[PDB]
Ligand binder design. Structure first.
Ligand SMILES: Nc1ncnc2c1ncn2[C@@H]1O[C@H](CSCC[C@H](N)C(=O)O)[C@@H](O)[C@H]1O
Lengths: 265, 265
């Protein structure tokens, strides 16, 4: 009579924690969703093979509208696991699912996994210096989202870094590239003219964190906007005021122009 | 010729990822540090037994002053692993270690693991709403640091949550409790009187994140300041204004008082 929320990590099936694997291996039923993020280095088959169980993949609709009809029923009489990319409760609405489990008289436990939220550390930017986070969403029809632009503005004024999750439309197999995010932001700048995101703005790109050779790049928008960062997923970061050691790392590791070594203070 | 920065995860020896464990087992030399944090749910012996390699523990000075004379020389002719609690490169000064490896002609790769930065998502607080983070340091002598108080102020002012790490003396294995952190903040409030941290302020306490049975509590400072949250480590969070969904999770999962559904939303 237990439900396990288990994260699978950043890139492939091996990013799951040992705790998560051992517990998953012993669950009666295993469910999972792969719409909240992209695990570019694995396949359902490899995950199933590793866990030694069949995995019933659920759609966003299955989860958001039918979690209590598809998963909870079995958790009332068995040990059930629900797998997700990265950490199960990060930048998702999955936390609320625990309230649903509770209301159904089902106990739930959470097994964390590496998340893009902490993986940003590989960019050299001090993680405590990150401010509010946001998501660059694809415009649809006449609706053109722009709130994420205001988040960068608010953080930048405080000298804080901004983590930008990029949009994803799993059913259409669409994964926003850092390039597309930069294009959208330049358009918002043209509209708002707040001097928040321009061709000279320094940005950082982290692609396929979790893999052994992720792409880590830093530089002016004008120079990176047309660069190929490899396959998704990508995240975009707009740093705030940099510490000298952050700049050094960006230059030495992310190939940023030596020019940024000269921090204004 | 290769140095692997491997995260050990949140709480015990099983919090390392399958990737991290398999890679560690293949290394000729394995180093680790426990001064930035400790794995309170396990021991060096259990970690060593799991990895099946003797682990040479390094102190803060060993790392910060002599990383290149202790770790890097061996990494030039062998596969070397450097284990740290949580996610590698989260601790402020670790990213710089990759620069030292580069300068030494040594390749380095990062193997992520769960970090408290993302694990706090288990409190039900939306990850994107966290602002700048800080550490609550013990006053001492004529030194009474209060910057962490200003961090809370600036975040809450913008409706953002504040993640507060509590002071730790690794060597002496002396943890700051959430209770202690609260008393300190109340004392800082009585000095700056900015109306930031009072007896009525809503706070969240997360203890032993990573374990299957963590302690998640929420309520006013006056009612939690004397409560027993169990064994360390403890993490303190001062939430900004709550999303109704956040509040509902805190009430249903963390036993928060029903009143936050109207008082803090
Ligand atoms: N390995 C990875 N590399 C780069 N970006 C990633 C990533 N994994 C997730 N993301 C980013 O985050 C978005 C999904 S948000 C959900 C995040 C997940 N719970 C976690 O803990 O990581 C993606 O669209 C992408 O922009």
């Amino acid at each position: 009579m237990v439900l396990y929320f288990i994260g699978l990590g950043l890139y492939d099936e091996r990013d799951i924690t040992v705790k998560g694997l051992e517990i998953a291996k012993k669950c009666d039923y295993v469910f999972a969703e792969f719409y909240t993020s992209l695990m570019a280095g694995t396949t359902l088959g490899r995950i199933q093979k590793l866990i030694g169980k069949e995995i019933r993949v659920l759609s966003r609709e299955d989860v958001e509208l039918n979690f209590e009809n598809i998963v909870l029923p079995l958790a009332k009489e068995n040990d059930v696991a629900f797998l997700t990319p990265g950490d199960p409760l990060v930048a998702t609405t999955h936390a609320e699912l625990r309230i649903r489990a509770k209301r159904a008289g089902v106990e739930s436990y959470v097994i964390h996994a590496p998340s893009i939220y902490s993986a940003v550390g590989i960019t050299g930017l001090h993680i405590y210096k990150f401010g509010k986070s946001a998501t660059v969403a694809y415009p649809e029809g006449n609706w053109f989202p722009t709130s994420y632009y205001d988040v960068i503005k608010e953080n930048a004024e405080r000298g804080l870094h901004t983590l930008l999750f990029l949009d994803i439309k799993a059913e259409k197999r669409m994964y926003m590239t850092a390039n597309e995010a930069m294009e959208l932001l330049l358009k918002v700048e043209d509209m708002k003219k707040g001097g928040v995101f321009t061709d000279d703005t320094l940005v950082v790109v982290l692609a396929r964190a979790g893999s052994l050779n992720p792409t880590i790049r830093a530089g002016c928008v004008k120079d990176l906007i047309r660069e190929d960062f490899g396959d998704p997923p990508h995240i975009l970061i707009v740093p705030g005021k940099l510490h000298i050691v952050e700049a050094e790392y960006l230059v030495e590791i992310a190939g940023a122009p030596r020019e940024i070594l000269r921090v204004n203070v």
